[PDB]
Ligand binder design. Structure first.
Ligand SMILES: Nc1ncnc2c1ncn2[C@@H]1O[C@H](COP(=O)(O)OP(=O)(O)NP(=O)(O)O)[C@@H](O)[C@H]1O
Ligand SMILES: [Mn+2]
Ligand SMILES: [Mn+2]
Length: 336
């Protein structure tokens, strides 16, 4: 906790949610669907101004895909994180078939579709979103947590236009002085030390930050092949072999190259002053970090959200008519 005021605020919030039951909520509309389950916008019956994104997961699909540890870690990390740049997980529920994760609703919409529709983001737009991620990473890395799934698809906008990290399925708390060893992530975004199975730590995230900048500035990540093997070889060749288009400002290219160092120990953010070295890079000259943290900074893209029940920034989905999944009572979900 930052201080005693924050400690007390979060304990009061936890006690507020501990008292709630699934029956205290109304379903408003669906935010997303898939084989994993659905994300529903839900409303607190006793306080209609409080709405939430409830991710409802079929437990059998989690077991089939061997993601029990991933979802347990997602719960622990997300429920324990208290950052304005990370979607809050307030609490969980469970029954025999489903897990329910009650999260902060971000009603501004998905960033990746905006990026696709515009082709690429201007320098100042990209700088705002990159700074949001930089703050989220400052928090996570201060707690020894690797995020490990940075990509435009895992950035969601709230109603103001602030970006937040969602989807902690690959996030992991790493022990002090330890590395982690699982080959996972999206191929274009995986760092070379993950490809070479040398173990990785929070510095892999700084690699991903570079990729993100490049993608946001150009519409595509810098390393890409026809199949993941060629992509991995390209990655192992290094960022210094990638052509930086003139579209990318010189300071942005410099920062990307410092983030995508082959050696994790040399990556900006992993040096003497940690994430502060990223924040002081000349690309961020004139960027109001204090205003970003205070919420006074004007986002580059303003979604309009008329009310806490407005889902107009999300696709429409027919309500669930699928067969209920089989019961799952193996017991790996005790803490939920
Ligand atoms: N807190 C949230 N607020 C608003 N929309 C959300 C929220 N969480 C998830 N969504 C939406 O639901 C989608 C699924 O979220 P996600 O955390 O990626 O679950 P998932 O199990 O990984 N589904 P998928 O990405 O298809 O594998 C997101 O891409 C968003 O469009
Ligand atoms: Mn996702
Ligand atoms: Mn996902």
């Amino acid at each position: 906790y930052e201080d005693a005021e924050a400690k007390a605020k979060y304990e009061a919030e936890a006690a507020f949610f501990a008292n709630l039951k699934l029956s205290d909520f109304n379903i408003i509309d669906t935010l997303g669907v898939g084989g994993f389950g659905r994300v529903e916008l839900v409303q607190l019956k006793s306080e209609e101004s409080k709405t939430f994104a409830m991710k409802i997961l079929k437990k059998r699909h989690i077991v089939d895909t061997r993601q029990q540890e991933h979802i347990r870690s997602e719960k622990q990390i997300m429920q324990g994180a208290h950052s304005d740049f990370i979607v809050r997980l307030y609490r969980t529920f469970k029954d025999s078939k489903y897990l329910y994760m009650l999260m902060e609703a971000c009603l501004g919409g998905e960033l990746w579709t905006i990026l696709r529709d515009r082709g690429s983001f201007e320098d100042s737009t990209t700088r705002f979103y990159t700074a949001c991620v930089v703050e989220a990473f400052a928090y996570l890395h201060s707690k020894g947590i690797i995020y490990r799934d940075l990509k435009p698809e895992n950035l969601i906008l709230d109603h103001r236009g602030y970006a937040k990290l969602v989807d902690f399925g690959f996030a992991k708390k790493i022990g002090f002085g330890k590395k982690t060893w699982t080959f996972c992530g999206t191929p274009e975004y995986v760092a070379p030390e993950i490809i070479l199975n040398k173990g990785h730590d929070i510095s892999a995230d700084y690699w991903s930050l570079g990729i993100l900048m490049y993608e946001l500035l150009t519409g595509s990540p810098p390393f890409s092949g026809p199949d993941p093997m060629k992509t991995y070889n390209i990655i192992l060749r290094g960022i210094d072999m990638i052509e930086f288009p003139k579209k990318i400002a010189k300071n942005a290219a410099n920062l990307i190259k410092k983030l995508c160092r082959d050696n994790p120990s040399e990556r900006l953010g992993n040096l003497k002053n940690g994430v502060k070295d990223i924040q002081k890079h000349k690309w961020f000259e004139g960027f109001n970090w204090e205003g970003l943290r205070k919420g006074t900074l004007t986002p580059p893209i303003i979604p309009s959200v008329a009310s806490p029940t407005d889902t107009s920034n999300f696709d429409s989905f027919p309500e669930d008519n699928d067969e209920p999944p089989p019961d799952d009572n193996s017991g790996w979900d005790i803490d939920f």
